[PDB]
Amino acid sequence: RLGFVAGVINRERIPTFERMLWRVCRGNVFLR
Amino acid sequence: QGIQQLLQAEKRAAEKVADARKRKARRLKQAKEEAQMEVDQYRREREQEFQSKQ
Amino acid sequence: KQFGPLVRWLKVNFSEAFIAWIHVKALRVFVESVLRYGLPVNFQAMLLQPNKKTM
Amino acid sequence: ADVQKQIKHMMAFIEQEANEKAEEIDAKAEEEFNIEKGRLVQTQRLKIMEYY
Amino acid sequence: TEFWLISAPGTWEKLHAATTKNNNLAVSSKFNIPDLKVGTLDVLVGLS
């Protein structure tokens, strides 16, 4: 139905963002 | 390699959600044509008493 | 005259509220288990017991 | 590996809501199919009851 | 008195008895809860 959002982020926190974003939504995400 | 297989399942979920839109609409158009059986019920119910009282 | 009336009230209301928090903990345990684990039909249910000084 | 596990959870979560949102339309097609039949039959009798 | 309640899903219900083999930690009771109603994804995380 829905579920697409596009953005940009720096590479100095890209590994720290995907580690924290998984614990906040309790999974149920696909971040490539 | 997983985003292509994920979007095809939601595209399969779109027609299943539209099949309910093709099932709720199918029971509604059938109801407006099965309501004519009430017209055929009262027409035979009135003619039995519009001749015994005539 | 209000001692026996209140002690009979606190004996049944606190037991209802402690069972209400126990039911809300299982609702918090039924939640966050279908998101942390997969939801084919239902996740495997399990619990634990208390422990002292070896946590 | 572990990212393929989250893809399998999304396939079970999207098909579950696709089964819930379609069955809720069927439950709306179960209550309103008789509520429109009972309303139209009471309406059709009144157009003949004045003629009766 | 304290308490800890942790669920560990995936047989899979027999590995919960393997936590009872560590006798110095816990007894690892089952404490089963019945099946509830599901069918929400946005409202499941919104109820959290």
Swiss-Prot record, chain B:
Q: Where in the cell is it found?
A: Melanosome; Cytoplasmic vesicle, Clathrin-coated vesicle membrane
Judging by the UniProt lineage, the source's domain of life is: Eukaryota
Q: Where is the composition biased (Basic and acidic residues)?
A: 30-50
Transmembrane stretches, start-end: none
Q: In which tissues is it expressed?
A: Expressed in brain (at protein level).
The record describes its quaternary structure and partners as: V-ATPase is a heteromultimeric enzyme made up of two complexes: the ATP-hydrolytic V1 complex and the proton translocation V0 complex. The V1 complex consists of three catalytic AB heterodimers that form a heterohexamer, three peripheral stalks each consisting of EG heterodimers, one central rotor including subunits D and F, and the regulatory subunits C and H. The proton translocation complex V0 consists of the proton transport subunit a, a ring of proteolipid subunits c9c'', rotary subunit d, subunits e and f, and the accessory subunits ATP6AP1/Ac45 and ATP6AP2/PRR.
Similarity remark: Belongs to the V-ATPase G subunit family.
What's this protein's function? Subunit of the V1 complex of vacuolar(H+)-ATPase (V-ATPase), a multisubunit enzyme composed of a peripheral complex (V1) that hydrolyzes ATP and a membrane integral complex (V0) that translocates protons. V-ATPase is responsible for acidifying and maintaining the pH of intracellular compartments and in some cell types, is targeted to the plasma membrane, where it is responsible for acidifying the extracellular environment.
Q: What is this protein called?
A: V-type proton ATPase subunit G 2
Species annotation: Bos taurus
Q: Write the gene name.
A: ATP6V1G2
Within the intact protein, the region shown is: 6 to 59 of 118
Swiss-Prot record, chain C:
Q: Superkingdom, according to UniProt?
A: Eukaryota
Query: Signal peptide span per the entry?
Result: none
Q: Where in the cell is it found?
A: Cytoplasmic vesicle, Secretory vesicle, Synaptic vesicle membrane; Cytoplasmic vesicle, Clathrin-coated vesicle membrane
In what tissue types does this protein appear? Expressed in brain (at protein level).
- Main role? Subunit of the V1 complex of vacuolar(H+)-ATPase (V-ATPase), a multisubunit enzyme composed of a peripheral complex (V1) that hydrolyzes ATP and a membrane integral complex (V0) that translocates protons. V-ATPase is responsible for acidifying and maintaining the pH of intracellular compartments and in some cell types, is targeted to the plasma membrane, where it is responsible for acidifying the extracellular environment. Subunit C is necessary for the assembly of the catalytic sector of the enzyme and is likely to have a specific function in its catalytic activity.
Family named by the database record: Belongs to the V-ATPase C subunit family.
Name assigned to this protein:
V-type proton ATPase subunit C 1
Q: Which organism is it from?
A: Bos taurus (Bovine)
UniProtKB/Swiss-Prot annotation, chain D:
**Modification Phosphotyrosine, positions:** 51
Task: State where the protein is found.
Answer: Apical cell membrane; Cytoplasmic vesicle, Secretory vesicle, Synaptic vesicle membrane; Cytoplasmic vesicle, Clathrin-coated vesicle membrane
Tissue expression profile of the protein: Expressed in brain (at protein level).
Query: Superkingdom, according to UniProt?
Result: Eukaryota
Please give the family membership noted in the entry. Belongs to the V-ATPase E subunit family.
Q: How does it assemble?
A: V-ATPase is a heteromultimeric enzyme made up of two complexes: the ATP-hydrolytic V1 complex and the proton translocation V0 complex. The V1 complex consists of three catalytic AB heterodimers that form a heterohexamer, three peripheral stalks each consisting of EG heterodimers, one central rotor including subunits D and F, and the regulatory subunits C and H. The proton translocation complex V0 consists of the proton transport subunit a, a ring of proteolipid subunits c9c'', rotary subunit d, subunits e and f, and the accessory subunits ATP6AP1/Ac45 and ATP6AP2/PRR.
Q: What does this protein do?
A: Subunit of the V1 complex of vacuolar(H+)-ATPase (V-ATPase), a multisubunit enzyme composed of a peripheral complex (V1) that hydrolyzes ATP and a membrane integral complex (V0) that translocates protons. V-ATPase is responsible for acidifying and maintaining the pH of intracellular compartments and in some cell types, is targeted to the plasma membrane, where it is responsible for acidifying the extracellular environment.
Full-protein positions shown: 6 to 57 of 226
From Swiss-Prot, chain E:
Q: Where in the cell is it found?
A: Cytoplasmic vesicle, Secretory vesicle, Synaptic vesicle membrane; Cytoplasmic vesicle, Clathrin-coated vesicle membrane
Look up the domain of life of the source.
Answer: Eukaryota
Q: In which tissues is it expressed?
A: Expressed in brain (at protein level).
Q: Which residues carry this modification: N-acetylthreonine?
A: 1
Family label: Belongs to the V-ATPase C subunit family.
What does the annotation say about its assembly with partners? Answer: V-ATPase is a heteromultimeric enzyme made up of two complexes: the ATP-hydrolytic V1 complex and the proton translocation V0 complex. The V1 complex consists of three catalytic AB heterodimers that form a heterohexamer, three peripheral stalks each consisting of EG heterodimers, one central rotor including subunits D and F, and the regulatory subunits C and H. The proton translocation complex V0 consists of the proton transport subunit a, a ring of proteolipid subunits c9c'', rotary subunit d, subunits e and f, and the accessory subunits ATP6AP1/Ac45 and ATP6AP2/PRR.
The name on file for this protein is V-type proton ATPase subunit C 1
Q: Which organism is it from?
A: Bos taurus
> Where is the organism placed in the taxonomic lineage, from the top?
Eukaryota, Metazoa, Chordata, Craniata, Vertebrata
**Which residues of the parent protein does this chain contain?**
2 to 55 of 382
